[PDB]
């Protein structure tokens, strides 16, 4: 909040590492759907799990090597977003996950 007054150069990977990825969460068809903008990761590095009964944890790691003169560095190397779900997830719940066009879509059965 009100880091909006900074200019783009002053916003670092660290800032985006706090707030990324942006997320949409909705229910349709007796399914909890969590949609995330997580561009540019390897799907075998994206680690999502529900800890407890309430918390989706989205973790992801990527290597960023940009040789030359730096000017802007905003894209996160690491991500660790914690989202509290409005639904109790069964331990044996069959959760699907897809990574397409940089978007992670997680479907959680509730009904």
């Amino acid at each position: 909040g009100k880091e909006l007054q900074k200019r783009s150069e002053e916003l670092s990977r660290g800032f985006y590492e706090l707030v990324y990825p942006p997320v949409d969460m909705y229910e349709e068809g007796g399914y909890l759907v969590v949609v995330a903008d997580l561009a540019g990761f390897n799907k075998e590095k994206i680690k999502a799990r529900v800890s407890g009964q309430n918390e989706l944890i989205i973790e992801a790691e990527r290597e960023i090597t940009e040789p030359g003169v730096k000017y802007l560095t905003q894209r996160p190397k690491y991500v660790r977003k914690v989202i509290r779900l409005p639904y109790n997830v069964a331990k044996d719940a069959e959760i699907s996950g897809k990574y397409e066009n940089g978007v992670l879509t997680i479907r959680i059965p509730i009904a």
């Binding site: 799907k43 959760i95 997680i106």
Partner: peptide, 5 residues
């Protein structure tokens, strides 16, 4: 860990 398809 959720299987990302």
């Amino acid at each position: 860990v959720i299987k990302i398809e």
